[PDB]
Amino acid sequence: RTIKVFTTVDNINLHTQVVDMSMTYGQQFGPTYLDGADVTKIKPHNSHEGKTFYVLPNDDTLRVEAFEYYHTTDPSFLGRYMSALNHTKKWKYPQVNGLTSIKWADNNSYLATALLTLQQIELKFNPPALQDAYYRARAGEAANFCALILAYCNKTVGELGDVRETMSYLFQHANLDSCKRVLNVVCKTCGQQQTTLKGVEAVMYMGTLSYEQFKKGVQIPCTCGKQATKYLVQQESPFVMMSAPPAQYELKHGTFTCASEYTGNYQCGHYKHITSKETLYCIDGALLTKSSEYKGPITDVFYKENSYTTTI
Amino acid sequence: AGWDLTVKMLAGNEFQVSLSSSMSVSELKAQITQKIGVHAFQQRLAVHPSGVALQDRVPLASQGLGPGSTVLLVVDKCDEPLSILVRNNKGRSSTYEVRLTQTVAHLKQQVSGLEGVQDDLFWLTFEGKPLEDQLPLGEYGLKPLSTVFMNLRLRGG
Ligand SMILES: [Zn+2]
């Protein structure tokens, strides 16, 4: 005696299967998952009729479907994705006017900060899996997006994390081709040098949190011994990310999009999210606090941008 | 729809690889790696017989290549040592001798030793792309005197 189930890799192309109830799922499909739960070594229950199961791509059809969705051939992916999801569906996702954080659990503060950030910057993902999940995360059903973020970044539930590392890994899977940055580095021995950057490098800088400082110049050490001045000549992107080692920084309302606060060291630490709505919000996981002004250890600051040319 | 491509080698001998429409050069090289065990970065690919080079991020279906088309693979095993720079949080570029065949992991070992930091408390980037431990240096297209950035890893829970 048998039941009817669906096997898939994308939850788009569903394949009708008839399962012998005497054998494990594993004995018929190889590695098999029900909403992230590993049901490989489990015999089919009656309550499984008509339900969808994810499986390891194990034929040239499933392989095509899977790459078209995830943009990876990596055989471990559904393993690490489904393993993450199995935890992320059990987290709570509190909102403030549609902005979705995560109640603290399994050291998830960095994920929560990343998740909040992603909802406030104009970003277009390439793997349909990320784009689909990204649109459902903005709507409030965000557990799936978090599991994909963990998998793509190759981190696990429980592991400590860095928000800048995470955005760096994700930005590789985003279309940033239209993004362009032009800098001038002004030494006294090299002279003046103008470099044009594209993609990820056009939107991330590590050295200062201030966008207004980067526009009128920052001191960096040069190859030629002493100190050159780097400044921003032209910028064409929907946002910019400005990062620097955690430092006591004042965030003025209306002068930035959102920012990451880091309290701790290079062993253990904790992230809070600060965003500029009608006033300044401080979102520590589930807890929300409003203030007209904010000072604290900021490490990452996101700004809104369209097209900037300098006057120098 | 999936589709099959013919890879002609300069040894003369052919084989077949399975693609999907959204696949570009990276995945072809990764599929060739599968069948003949040659690092992606050591493969030069061009349309056969026209002999025009492949566009690096636009899909293969978008370019000339469709089902029944052929591509020429030639293999540059050249593994000469080269000098690369690895800059820390301060700004001090230090020079390391490496080969494009040795893993990012092996490079972190060297940088961990010289900068005196546990290998798992920093990550490396080249041109904004994170370097993954298990992959070889060649994948990230490092030239002689290319500058790898060392990033101190925050540990947020
Ligand atoms: Zn100089």
Numbering used by the authors:
A (entry chain A): 3 to 314
B (entry chain B): 1 to 157
Quote the study that presented this structure, word for word.
The Papain-like protease (PLpro) is a domain of a multi-functional, non-structural protein 3 of coronaviruses. PLpro cleaves viral polyproteins and posttranslational conjugates with poly-ubiquitin and protective ISG15, composed of two ubiquitin-like (UBL) domains.
The structures of PLpro in both complexes are similar with an rmsd of 0.85 Å, but the binding surface contacts of the proximal Ub are shifted towards the fingers domain of PLpro compared to the proximal UBL domain of ISG15. By contrast, in our PLproCoV-2:hISG15 structure residue 30 of hISG15 is an alanine, thus leaving M23 alone to stabilize the interaction with F69 of PLproCoV-2, while the N-terminus of hISG15 interacts with V66 of PLproCoV-2. The interaction is centered on a salt bridge between E167 of PLproCoV-2 and R153 of hISG15, while the equivalent arginine (R151) in mISG15 is not oriented properly to form a salt bridge. The strongly attenuated signals of hISG15 residues, including the C-terminal G157, are consistent with our crystal structure of the PLproCoV-2:hISG15 complex. We identified two contacts between D61 and D62 on PLproCoV-2 to K35 on the distal UBL of hISG15 (19 and 43 contacts) which map well onto our structure with the distances between carboxylates (D61 and D62) and Nζ (K35) of 14.9 and 8.6 Å, respectively with Cβ-Cβ ﻿distances below 30 Å consistent with the cross-linker geometry.
